UniProtKB/Swiss-Prot annotation:
Component of some HBO1 complex composed of KAT7/HBO1, MEAF6, ING4 and BRD1/BRPF2. Component of the MOZ/MORF complex composed at least of ING5, KAT6A, KAT6B, MEAF6 and one of BRPF1, BRD1/BRPF2 and BRPF3. Interacts (via PHD-type zinc finger domain) with unmodified histone H3. Interacts (via PWWP domain) with dimethylated and trimethylated 'Lys-79' on histone H3. This is Bromodomain-containing protein 1. Residues 9-113 form the Bromo domain. It comes from the Eukaryota. It is found in: Nucleus; Chromosome. Highly expressed in testis. Scaffold subunit of various histone acetyltransferase (HAT) complexes, such as the MOZ/MORF and HBO1 complexes, that acts as a regulator of hematopoiesis. Plays a key role in HBO1 complex by directing KAT7/HBO1 specificity towards histone H3 'Lys-14' acetylation (H3K14ac), thereby promoting erythroid differentiation. There is a cross-link at residue 41 (Glycyl lysine isopeptide (Lys-Gly) (interchain with G-Cter in SUMO2)).
Length: 121
C-alpha cells in the first residue's frame, strides 16, 4: 500500500536525522571513550555491574537497520552510555568526568533534534 510506503519514507527520514545526531554526539567524544563496547575480556566483572551495556558502535548498527522508531528510543540508548559509565566508574575518574561532559554537550544537540522531529513531523 501507499500508506505503508509513506510510513517507510518517514522512518527513513528519521533515520537520516538520527545519523546526523549520532555523528554530532560522537564528535563530542574525541578520545573515543564511548565508541566501542567495553570488552568483557578486560573489565571481566563488567556484566555483574552493568545490565545493559551500550556504546556508539552498537547504536550505529541499530540505526543502520532503521531500528529507532522515535527520538525517545535513541535518547534512551544515549542515556545508557552515560549512565552506565557514571555507575561503574568513580566520580574522581577521567571516565566519569568524560560522561558528565558528554551529557552536557549532548543536551544541546538533543534539544534541537527534538524541535526538528516535532517540526518536520
Ligand atoms: Na559508582
Amino acid at each position: 500500500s501507499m500508506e505503508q510506503v509513506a510510513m517507510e519514507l518517514r522512518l527513513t527520514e528519521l533515520t537520516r536525522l538520527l545519523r546526523s545526531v549520532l555523528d554530532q554526539l560522537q564528535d563530542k567524544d574525541p578520545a573515543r571513550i564511548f565508541a566501542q563496547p567495553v570488552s568483557l575480556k578486560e573489565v571481566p566483572d563488567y556484566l555483574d555491574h552493568i545490565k545493559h551495556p551500550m556504546d556508539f558502535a552498537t547504536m550505529r548498527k541499530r540505526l543502520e537497520a532503521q531500528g529507532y522508531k522515535n527520538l525517545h528510543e535513541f535518547e534512551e540508548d544515549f542515556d545508557l552510555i552515560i549512565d552506565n559509565c557514571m555507575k561503574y566508574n568513580a566520580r574522581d575518574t577521567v571516565f566519569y568526568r568524560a560522561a558528565v561532559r558528554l551529557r552536557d554537550q549532548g543536551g544541546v544537540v538533543l534539544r534541537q533534534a527534538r524541535r526538528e522531529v516535532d517540526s518536520i513531523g
